[PDB]
């Protein structure tokens, strides 16, 4: 069930055949009588290798994710936990942009779609830990988001290196239950990716993310006891040919934490990244 540098748990994948018949969709809030989806979630046992022994060796180009040290003020943390929208869109956005610039040397970072999450929150499934394995954007979604958020500069910006990141930070520390797991992007096969339209409304409103199916080739990681100063940067898209075109991420129930542990809290924001290495 567990060892010194790894443990076992479960995450919700999709079937390895899913999406070959027709386009997959999932309704967030189906009305009574409305079919919620044309596919089933399927849990699968996964071995989560602790990244803590090798924390600094993980790379956005090689693995598709990285862990970086970046302390922010306690006052900003409590403002974020207090659902201060101005604190998120102002100071924290600026924090995330500066961090990504530090890490990648990019010329321009655009933050969007912040999500503050709490174990068994009351803000819905997007304010709660993610239980389905996913990559936030397909190529079509990352490209669309660039036009949506950059307007006239989109074509100019897309002539250079274009990446999309999920930047994840714990709000209470250390993270024990429901940590954010990440997979080595070199161990994702093309057949593991399945676009799924997430219908927050009646009809499809954007381009879709990827959901993953399980493979034994996948090498899954987590950073045990992650602290508020340890930031996870997970690559959702990359326009350059690198060993990891993308990573994927999801949370899992840790089998060795007390039942009465306090709820996991965190904030993740997405960002478009132009330039850099
Ligand atoms: C429990 O839901 C999750 O596990 C994930 C999640 O928590 C969130 C917040 C999501 O945002 C998505 C899809 C995911 C990754 C889901 C799968 C949808 C639901 C709304 C915002 C869009 C958007 C920003 C317009 O960009 C898109 O490319 C379309 C897909 C996302 C990224
Ligand atoms: O925090 C979680 O459980 C899930 N987070 C994400 O999917 C993300 O950062 O894109
Ligand atoms: Fe995500």
Author numbering: 2 to 278
Copy text verbatim from the article accompanying this structure deposition.
NvfI from Aspergillus novofumigatus IBT 16806 is an endoperoxidase that catalyzes the formation of fumigatonoid A in the biosynthesis of novofumigatonin. Our biosynthetic analysis of novofumigatonin revealed that the Fe(II)/α-KG-dependent enzyme NvfI accepts asnovolin A (2) as a substrate and introduces three oxygen atoms, including an endoperoxide bridge and C-3’-hydroxyl group, to generate fumigatonoid A.12 Sequence and phylogenetic analyses of the NvfI homologs and characterized Fe(II)/α-KG-dependent enzymes in secondary metabolite biosynthesis indicated that NvfI shares low sequence similarity (10–15% amino acid identity) and belongs to a different clade from FtmOx1. The active site of NvfI is located in the DSBH core and an Fe is coordinated by the His135-His137-Asp250 triad, which is conserved in α-KG-dependent oxygenases. Further, the crystallographic analysis reveals significant conformational changes of two loops upon substrate binding, which suggests a dynamic movement of active site during the catalytic cycle.
